[PDB]
Symmetry: D4
Subunit: 145 residues, 8 copies
């Protein structure tokens, strides 16, 4: 055959990041919560981090790493929780990668054209809230343009 020497991939943009920030900020407001929102591009690289003024300062690292975890492992941070419990197959996964791997909900990959173009991360509510606001961002994304 011919070798593929380079491949074509889609990355999410700041434009799109910026818009999902506003969705999240508007949804978080009416469920009466202050969160950090993060979006990473397709390589896991920080595009946006945005912290509501009443949100936990502890939640900026968390929110970023949920995005990076969601993009890197290609799934929600909620989907790895069961695998990392004492006694489960991937127990100790949470200790790798300088502890960047987040293992509770709040981080989602962004899927465009059967492909992971980036990810989002929300922190500073309950875990159920984080994840609801994370899907909320995705639902904004898919609507755009």
């Amino acid at each position: 055959s011919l070798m593929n020497k380079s491949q074509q991939v889609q990355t999410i943009t700041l434009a799109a990041a910026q818009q999902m920030a506003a969705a999240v900020e508007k949804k978080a407001t009416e469920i009466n919560v202050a969160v950090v929102f993060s979006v990473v591009d397709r390589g896991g690289n920080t595009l946006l981090i945005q912290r509501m003024d009443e949100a936990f300062v502890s939640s900026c690292d968390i929110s970023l790493n949920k995005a990076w975890s969601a993009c890197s492992l290609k799934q929600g941070t909620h989907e790895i929780t069961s695998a990392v419990q004492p006694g489960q197959s991937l127990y100790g996964l949470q200790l790798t990668n300088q502890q960047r791997i987040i293992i509770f909900g709040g981080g989602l990959p962004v899927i465009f054209n059967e492909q992971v173009i980036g990810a989002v991360g929300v922190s500073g509510g309950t875990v159920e809230q984080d994840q609801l606001l994370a899907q909320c961002a995705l639902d904004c994304f898919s609507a755009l343009e």
Copy 2:
């Protein structure tokens, strides 16, 4: 809707922290334990760390990071202990933020005007003792004017 380019907040003062340290060093003597005692401002930055001679040296870093957690999480460090055991919804949190979120008792926020203005951390006793002494610091603070 007129929009706010700034926010007026309140922070605890070094001289408040110094009074707090007097009261802890006293009460630690009366119950016969040596501890390390820490105060952080509104942004979790250090105001005051004090180690009694006989307090473990491993308690320096813990005392400070108890103060930091209770600030950033705006709750007592004992309050999160339940949430982060295996199987629970925030298991893994103790590994975030370069392991500065301490998950056992002895950190408490200074609440003034319904608002987190600062925090204290006591390390070196039992968990029960650390939490008692740290309460003692807040009892003092609300007795100053």
Copy 3:
């Protein structure tokens, strides 16, 4: 005695205004940058990277903002202090190297306080600085 000081901090709303402003100048002067704002106590409010800004510019942008808030001054005003043979040689090595020692970070002075700071990284130093200043200029004509 006083058990608490009143102080002032920049908001997310402010930082968002300033970001749109910085993205707008950066586009016209043909340069892709990272823009970061921190609050009063030096903590992260808003970080943004344009799609073409160097991925190593994320780290620096935030740290510029942090240093300008920390040191109550612009990160360009320290560059000379720190050279070999000079009194604060080595200050770049403290604080997990989070002290940035070239221009592009600037405080938000408001009300004769330091209420937070901005940091810009991406293009030349002077481009960063100009784009940083247009962030502040924006801030002043918010009400």
Copy 4:
């Protein structure tokens, strides 16, 4: 609004070829090196260390690749800018000391995009930069 740009990244297969060109060419010049290729986000594809290479050159080589990618230019380019007295003195300390300021790191520039990068360490800076250009020349000769 554009919610996603198309971009382009080097493959593992391409990095394996560059590695085999560098490996031969290092030995013909009588040096042992470490070769590292990063993709578009500067994420690792490959690290390959010759037996007699310095184990110190592993992290150096990877960070040469990451640097070149993220800065979009050669680690050899930034060397004059970071010298004491210059404008970017203190860049070297940023990003957890990953920004390597001496020659050896080169971006892979296919379609006017940095699509990734390579880094060689283990020799002189001159030999390092020779080997890395020698890998880029492997790539642009591939199909």
Copy 5:
């Protein structure tokens, strides 16, 4: 008793590691997973890291540190999993050594002459899959001469 100022040991060679990587990349394809594959020498220093395009990027650091653990512990990384669960005699070990001791399967030592000469690490599949592939690397090595 004459005393030894040096010791003759054996180490695995880069060209051995390159053959091993060929065989893993092959067998990963045939079972349909993308992984990252790592080899370390007699002292746990890196010989070869290889990430297939689609393998998680969080597996780079894991693959390498599996190779490192199985070298330094002179056993399979699956072999310590039992010992380090809560309540067990080496709980806490996973936190040592800057979190480089990986406590789930996929690291295996190259034993030659009854002697640890090197190690391999596979990360990116299930734990079962990683351990299969890493075995595959050793099967290959002992078939070379």
Copy 6:
């Protein structure tokens, strides 16, 4: 009263460290095990680290930190194991101090004149062995001079 402005304390020496190294090395040999041995002085500061040639390279950090843990917390590393289990008071202690706190046996404080003058640490056997060789060092110490 008069303030004590400085206090008098005893520190262990290299001399003594060196001698307990030989005891340990001789005992480890006849129970057929290769270990790392460490001794810290009274401030927790490294006096000696000594690695048998067949011992796990993973065991140098461990062995040092067992000593530093034994000196810092003023007790054996075996005595904190029960306190740090999930659900126990000091759960998460193992995450503090850059993870230097070791929580399985093998580290002992050295007690001279009702005072902790330093500590020892052994690693690279079973935990029971480490601790047996650690007491073995103490038993050598008390015999000296």
Copy 7:
């Protein structure tokens, strides 16, 4: 054989006095500083940060104390040795960048033993070293 030496360490009580002498003297000269005292092993006794001090000076101040203790001499002493071209160029990078090379850190020398140390940061290096000597003078006036 001697299995244990007697040594000697500063107390918390003594560090509290030095802290209160520095705190007054900083304000009389119109600067805000961070004061830190380490014991004989360079283990922390005290960190006390004036409200208007740079939060960057916390880690600087502690590491001034630790440095002085461990090196047994003033951080001001080693400054000439670590300059580029000199014999100890690259000391500054050792020990996780804890070895601070500019003035502010002084050992407490009671009975010809370093028994611990102090560090001040927040001013000029000149003011820093003034304040720290000013703390040693508090100690040697105590009983």
Copy 8:
């Protein structure tokens, strides 16, 4: 092909001989030092501090030994390579700053191999180096 290289490593027994030797000279030239040995692959065999050696000398001593093993050369032979303006300026910042760039670390060459290394820190550079060499000299008249 070859699937494995035979190599040679220093033993604990050797390192113990050399330590007694280094402690013996250090005592006569009136200086307290830390002495460290690493093995073939650069890993810790023996570290020893004399009761008066600066506590910051532990870190450096080991790292000297590590660099001399890593770079297959003495840590004094690199000092000139790394100055500002010179080709390996910055090499002191790689490898978590474990590259020591002043004298006092030296390899154990045995049998035209590098079989490990020593490192000495504590006194002047030249004292460290001399004491380092007397470690090697010791090693050569072991049998």
